[PDB]
């Protein structure tokens, strides 16, 4: 046997407050601006 990139595969739903969620490293005042409840 002689020898002669990064591909998209799908969209995975994120669980809120997880590492991948935006709201994970969010402060109290942060969440309020984001119209989320702390």
């Amino acid at each position: 046997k002689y020898e002669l990139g990064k591909v998209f595969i799908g969209r995975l739903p994120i669980m809120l407050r997880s590492k991948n969620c935006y709201l994970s490293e969010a402060t109290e005042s942060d969440l309020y601006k984001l119209k989320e409840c702390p």
Binding site: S29, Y32, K33, K35
Partner: protein, 65 residues
């Protein structure tokens, strides 16, 4: 959320007394039971109104529009 005007049980105006109560606690360091009584809230129906209030409005104000 937001102090009730008038005690449900007897209807003594309790709407004015809120800030005054919150003040007798921070500024005067006073315990809850004396502050209520200072404010003339003698019947427990009236006492429960202020003593057990949760002013959620203040959180509600934290959102922009």
């Amino acid at each position: 959320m937001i102090v009730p005007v008038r005690c449900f049980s007897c209807g003594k105006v309790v709407g004015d007394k809120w800030e005054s109560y919150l003040n007798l606690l921070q500024e005067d360091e006073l315990d809850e039971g004396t502050a209520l009584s200072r404010l003339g809230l003698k019947r427990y129906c009236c006492r429960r109104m202020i003593l057990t209030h949760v002013d959620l409005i203040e959180k509600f104000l934290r959102y922009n529009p």
